[PDB]
Amino acid sequence: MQDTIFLKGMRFYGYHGALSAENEIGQIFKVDVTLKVDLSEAGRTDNVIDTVHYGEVFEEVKSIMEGKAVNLLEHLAERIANRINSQYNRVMETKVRITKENPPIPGHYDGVGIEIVRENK
Amino acid sequence: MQDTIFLKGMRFYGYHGALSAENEIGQIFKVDVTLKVDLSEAGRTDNVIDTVHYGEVFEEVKSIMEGKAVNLLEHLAERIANRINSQYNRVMETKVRITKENPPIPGHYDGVGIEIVRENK
Amino acid sequence: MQDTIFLKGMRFYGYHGALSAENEIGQIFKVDVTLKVDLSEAGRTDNVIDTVHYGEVFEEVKSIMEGKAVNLLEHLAERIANRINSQYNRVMETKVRITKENPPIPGHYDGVGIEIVRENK
Amino acid sequence: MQDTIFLKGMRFYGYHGALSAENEIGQIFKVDVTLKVDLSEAGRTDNVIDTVHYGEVFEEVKSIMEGKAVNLLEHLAERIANRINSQYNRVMETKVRITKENPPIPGHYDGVGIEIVRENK
Amino acid sequence: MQDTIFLKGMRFYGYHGALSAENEIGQIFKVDVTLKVDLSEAGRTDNVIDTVHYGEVFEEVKSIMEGKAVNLLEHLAERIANRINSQYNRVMETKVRITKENPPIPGHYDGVGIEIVRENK
Amino acid sequence: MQDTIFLKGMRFYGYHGALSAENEIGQIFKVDVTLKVDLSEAGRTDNVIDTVHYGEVFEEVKSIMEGKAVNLLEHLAERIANRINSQYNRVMETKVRITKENPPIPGHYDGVGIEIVRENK
Amino acid sequence: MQDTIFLKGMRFYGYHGALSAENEIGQIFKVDVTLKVDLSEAGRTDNVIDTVHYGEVFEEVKSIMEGKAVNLLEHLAERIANRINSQYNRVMETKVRITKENPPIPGHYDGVGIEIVRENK
Amino acid sequence: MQDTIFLKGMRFYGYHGALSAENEIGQIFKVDVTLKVDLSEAGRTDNVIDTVHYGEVFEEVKSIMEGKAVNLLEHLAERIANRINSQYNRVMETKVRITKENPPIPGHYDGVGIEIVRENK
Numbered sequence: 001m002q003d004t005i006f007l008k009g010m011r012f013y014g015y016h017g018a019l020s021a022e023n024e025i026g027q028i029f030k031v032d033v034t035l036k037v038d039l040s041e042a043g044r045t046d047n048v049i050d051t052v053h054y055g056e057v058f059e060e061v062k063s064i065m066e067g068k069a070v071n072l073l074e075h076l077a078e079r080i081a082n083r084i085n086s087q088y089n090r091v092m093e094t095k096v097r098i099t100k101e102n103p104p105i106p107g108h109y110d111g112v113g114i115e116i117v118r119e120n121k
Numbered sequence: 122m123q124d125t126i127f128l129k130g131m132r133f134y135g136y137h138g139a140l141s142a143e144n145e146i147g148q149i150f151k152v153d154v155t156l157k158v159d160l161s162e163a164g165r166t167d168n169v170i171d172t173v174h175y176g177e178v179f180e181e182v183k184s185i186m187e188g189k190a191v192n193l194l195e196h197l198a199e200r201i202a203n204r205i206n207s208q209y210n211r212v213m214e215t216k217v218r219i220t221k222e223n224p225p226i227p228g229h230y231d232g233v234g235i236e237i238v239r240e241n242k
Numbered sequence: 243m244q245d246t247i248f249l250k251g252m253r254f255y256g257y258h259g260a261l262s263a264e265n266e267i268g269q270i271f272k273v274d275v276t277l278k279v280d281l282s283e284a285g286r287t288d289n290v291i292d293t294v295h296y297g298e299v300f301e302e303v304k305s306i307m308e309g310k311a312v313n314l315l316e317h318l319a320e321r322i323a324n325r326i327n328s329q330y331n332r333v334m335e336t337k338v339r340i341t342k343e344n345p346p347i348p349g350h351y352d353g354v355g356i357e358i359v360r361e362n363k
Numbered sequence: 364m365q366d367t368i369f370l371k372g373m374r375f376y377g378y379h380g381a382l383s384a385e386n387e388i389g390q391i392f393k394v395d396v397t398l399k400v401d402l403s404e405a406g407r408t409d410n411v412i413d414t415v416h417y418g419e420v421f422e423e424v425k426s427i428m429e430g431k432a433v434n435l436l437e438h439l440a441e442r443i444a445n446r447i448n449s450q451y452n453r454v455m456e457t458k459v460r461i462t463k464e465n466p467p468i469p470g471h472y473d474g475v476g477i478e479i480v481r482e483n484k
Numbered sequence: 485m486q487d488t489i490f491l492k493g494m495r496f497y498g499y500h501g502a503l504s505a506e507n508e509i510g511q512i513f514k515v516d517v518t519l520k521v522d523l524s525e526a527g528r529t530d531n532v533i534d535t536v537h538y539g540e541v542f543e544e545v546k547s548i549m550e551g552k553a554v555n556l557l558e559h560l561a562e563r564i565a566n567r568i569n570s571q572y573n574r575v576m577e578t579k580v581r582i583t584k585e586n587p588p589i590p591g592h593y594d595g596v597g598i599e600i601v602r603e604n605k
Numbered sequence: 606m607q608d609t610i611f612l613k614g615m616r617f618y619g620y621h622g623a624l625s626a627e628n629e630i631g632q633i634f635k636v637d638v639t640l641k642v643d644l645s646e647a648g649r650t651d652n653v654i655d656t657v658h659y660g661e662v663f664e665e666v667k668s669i670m671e672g673k674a675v676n677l678l679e680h681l682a683e684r685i686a687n688r689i690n691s692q693y694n695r696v697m698e699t700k701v702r703i704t705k706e707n708p709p710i711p712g713h714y715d716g717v718g719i720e721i722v723r724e725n726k
Numbered sequence: 727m728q729d730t731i732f733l734k735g736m737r738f739y740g741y742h743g744a745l746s747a748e749n750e751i752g753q754i755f756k757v758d759v760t761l762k763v764d765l766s767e768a769g770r771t772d773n774v775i776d777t778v779h780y781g782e783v784f785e786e787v788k789s790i791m792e793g794k795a796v797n798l799l800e801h802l803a804e805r806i807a808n809r810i811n812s813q814y815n816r817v818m819e820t821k822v823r824i825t826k827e828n829p830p831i832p833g834h835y836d837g838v839g840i841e842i843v844r845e846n847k
Numbered sequence: 848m849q850d851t852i853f854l855k856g857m858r859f860y861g862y863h864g865a866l867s868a869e870n871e872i873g874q875i876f877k878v879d880v881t882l883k884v885d886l887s888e889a890g891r892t893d894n895v896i897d898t899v900h901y902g903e904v905f906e907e908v909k910s911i912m913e914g915k916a917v918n919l920l921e922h923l924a925e926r927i928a929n930r931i932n933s934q935y936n937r938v939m940e941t942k943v944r945i946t947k948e949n950p951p952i953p954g955h956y957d958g959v960g961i962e963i964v965r966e967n968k
């Protein structure tokens with residue numbers, strides 16, 4: 001199954017980070033979320049109730065990205081993956097990519113991040 | 122077989138959408154279409170009649186994207202996939218990606234959408 | 243005097259707009275603010291108290307951009323100009339540019355907007 | 364007076380051009396329109412009837428850009444300038460920039476064009 | 485084997501095309517070439533003679549892209565693939581992607597093209 | 606008079622440069638040319654013979670940019686300015702901007718260059 | 727006199743900033759420097775000794791941008807302006823623009839900064 | 848396992864290159880590094896000690912990219928791969944992509960490079 005639903009370049013200002021200074025000042029976190037979902041029925045019917053509502057998916061991502069400051073992006077993505085997989089059965093697998101385009105790293109790069117793929121059980 | 126024919130960043134202004142307000146004002150819909158086709162003969166011959174005409178493929182996408190307002194992008198992509206697969210036998214499979222870069226979602230992201238892959242039967 | 247302080251590509255999701263549908267769904271408003279200020283003293287001293295705090299300027303723009311939905315961008319910019327000019331005497335003139343990159347206009351363009359320049363009295 | 368109303372990166376597919384081949388195949392024409400207008404009243408009132416409607420301005424540009432194929436971009440811009448200046452008295456001056464990003468010129472450049480500034484009489 | 489050598493966004497002005505008008509005026513052709521090559525020896529030694537010279541690969545692409553005007557991009561890519569695979573044994577497979585960002589197609593898209601993958605025999 | 610004719614992002618690979626190594630390997634030179642010309646007649650008539658032919662202007666720039674390797678960009682721009690001003694009387698003034706996006710300078714920047722404005726005598 | 731020499735998008739990682747946390751972690755500072763210089767002689771002669779060496783100008787900017795952490799960007803730009811104006815007499819005026827694309831400001835914008843223009847005495 | 852840690856668009860100015868002139872003047876080298884790592888524990892715990900520190904990974908890349916000038920990018924990437932795989936056991940495989948956006952190649956392209964994938968033994 002190669003159908004997917006996606007939300008790209010989502011950006012939130014948060015205060016997560018392992019370094020105290022990080023959590024104090026904050027920074028923009030960019031997030032790409034790709035969900036595995038079979039879209040033929042919804043494509044057949046044309047009824048939103050046959051697919052996953054992205055607005056709902058964005059609010060779920062936002063709630064975690066703009067919430068309690070944690071240390072790792074790995075934690076930020078695991079909570080997102082695990083939260084989308086719970087409330088949605090049509091999502092067979094959730095891929096969450098988080099990027100810190102401006103970390104406390106002395107150099108010139110486009111960004112540093114992680115990406116996790118999590119199947120729905 | 123890894124040969125493909127493609128049309129990228131296609132953009133149409135339509136009025137599809139589940140919310141009444143959406144259909145009223147409208148918005149730009151971006152579409153990427155990738156077709157699976159064996160291009161060695163056409164590459165051998167150099168005769169357009171040995172490959173698929175993209176102009177024709179674009180008109181087909183345009184006709185659906187600028188037509189009757191439907192609810193889901195899933196419906197918009199299924200009709201595209203199913204319409205390219207019918208009129209072309211050299212297309213072994215059609216991939217349709219639709220993106221709503223500016224949906225009625227309160228936030229900052231690059232865009233939300235879907236992507237369907239459909240083999241030709 | 244050619245010194246300036248600036249905030250660029252500021253983006254807020256609001257519900258301003260002359261059309262009912264607009265105010266209902268909303269959209270991203272991009273704002274560029276350029277303030278006329280003599281920066282030699284601050285450049286001489288290196289004391290923030292000798293210049294204008296942009297954070298404060300951004301909060302002021304944000305408060306208006308994310309507040310009560312009004313009709314015109316002209317109103318949105320006049321309130322910004324008039325609000326920065328009041329609380330800051332070092333600002334000799336305020337330029338406010340607002341852009342609706344995705345208005346309810348059926349077409350292909352990069353964006354529509356306005357720009358006002360207002361001297362401090 | 365430094366207030367302005369603007370429409371940027373407007374893009375239409377037309378068939379204007381001095382060379383026969385040009386008019387036959389066509390190409391994308393990008394247009395930037397900047398109008399001089401005093402926006403304090405509209406900024407004061409918040410009444411669209413105190414400013415110029417861009418939708419109307421875009422339709423006017425579109426009608427000329429997607430109409431009868433002419434030779435020069437200079438003609439395309441003079442008709443735009445002269446047409447916006449007639450139907451709108453609040454526009455004290457109209458600036459029209461047209462760009463041929465892909466002309467029949469053998470080389471590598473970002474685009475070729477013209478720009479005219481026309482006061483309202 | 486996942487090592488690759490690549491040349492991206494290569495751009496040439498040519499006159500290929502099925503339509504007479506096309507061949508007359510011309511247009512920019514963008515080309516991405518990705519070659520499959522085992523790079524551990526060259527990575528071990530650091531001797532250019534243990535890998536494929538891209539300059540040579542670019543000249544080969546250029547010679548075909550700026551040569552005799554043909555009809556299909558499929559022909560343009562097959563000649564490239566077949567020409568790189570002949571003169572280089574370390575290339576186990578050649579992928580050639582050609583894009584017509586501005587074809588004679590009346591619309592708004594980022595570009596139309598093809599992509600062929602060809603193993604070295 | 607605020608009318609202008611322009612050619613932007615023109616790019617040529619040359620070997621100009623004060624350092625021997627520079628002239629040996631070469632580099633891409635980006636050029637923006639803006640000419641002052643009154644376009645109302647051409648806008649009135651629609652006759653190319655009432656304006657300046659950009660193709661001709663591009664060939665003139667190309668001939669100098671892809672010719673004999675000189676030392677300074679200042680020399681490269683003065684020859685361009687002086688060559689466009691001679692063969693065209695409708696050009697009241699020529700502005701030439703040249704950019705070395707990748708000079709032998711150890712650092713991270715978008716580019717270094719010069720810009721000359723030259724009136725037609 | 728409208729001739730200019732320029733260095734754009736220069737980027738350095740520094741630790742300047744009014745807030746302790748800022749100086750601790752650091753951030754990228756983008757700098758645009760535009761110098762007023764008459765380039766006809768250098769354009770006439772083609773002798774680097776008749777113009778200003780940008781490499782030298784970049785090293786001067788770099789030395790200040792990558793040096794002792796100060797509070798204001800206003801101080802960072804005044805030292806740059808004042809340092810280029812001293813060692814170069816052909817520079818009639820120096821414009822320095824500094825941008826903090828990622829300041830400790832909770833929001834979505836492209837960047838905040840200042841710009842100073844300083845004549846050479 | 849599809850989890851990954853990444854560093855993108857990393858840019859260093861070096862003097863590597865097979866041609867003498869290259870090593871003399873230098874150029875910007877862009878590097879993308881993608882490491883295979885299982886991130887569920889770190890995602891579970893939220894303890895940096897359960898994942899790989901990118902800062903450390905960037906310093907390792909920087910040390911090699913800004914060190915002794917070598918001939919091939921293949922050598923530059925093999926040393927990076929082999930150096931990250933040694934000091935980190937959680938990295939099951941390292942992918943290193945290096946790009947020369949501005950090589951001594953006479954033409955117009957976006958960049959030339961290589962990419963190596965190396966498993967950790």
Ligand SMILES: Cn1cnc2c(O)nc(N)nc21
Binds near residue numbers: 019074899900
């Ligand atoms: C060094 N560092 C700071 N924050 C981090 C995070 O969220 N993940 C990883 N792998 N490293 C981090």
Ligand SMILES: Cn1cnc2c(O)nc(N)nc21
Binds near residue numbers: 005048051052138
């Ligand atoms: C919430 N919503 C509105 N339109 C939609 C569409 O076309 N697809 C999906 N999945 N959600 C939509």
Ligand SMILES: Cn1cnc2c(O)nc(N)nc21
Binds near residue numbers: 259
């Ligand atoms: C047509 N229209 C809708 N909103 C507008 C605004 O804020 N300004 C102007 N000039 N026109 C508008």
Ligand SMILES: Cn1cnc2c(O)nc(N)nc21
Binds near residue numbers: 380381610657658660
């Ligand atoms: C050469 N050429 C073709 N079309 C043109 C136009 O519209 N203006 C100018 N100045 N030149 C043109």
Ligand SMILES: Cn1cnc2c(O)nc(N)nc21
Binds near residue numbers: 126174555556557
């Ligand atoms: C319609 N058309 C014109 N040129 C073409 C080409 O090279 N390939 C394909 N598939 N179609 C073309």
Ligand SMILES: Cn1cnc2c(O)nc(N)nc21
Binds near residue numbers: 623779
């Ligand atoms: C240092 N350097 C090398 N080439 C140059 C040029 O063309 N102009 C200027 N001002 N400096 C240069």
Ligand SMILES: Cn1cnc2c(O)nc(N)nc21
Binds near residue numbers: 247295297
């Ligand atoms: C709030 N703030 C922090 N650093 C600053 C700087 O350099 N200039 C200005 N105006 N404000 C600053």
Ligand SMILES: Cn1cnc2c(O)nc(N)nc21
Binds near residue numbers: 535
């Ligand atoms: C031609 N050339 C110069 N440097 C090179 C490098 O690092 N790799 C390859 N394959 N070719 C190179």
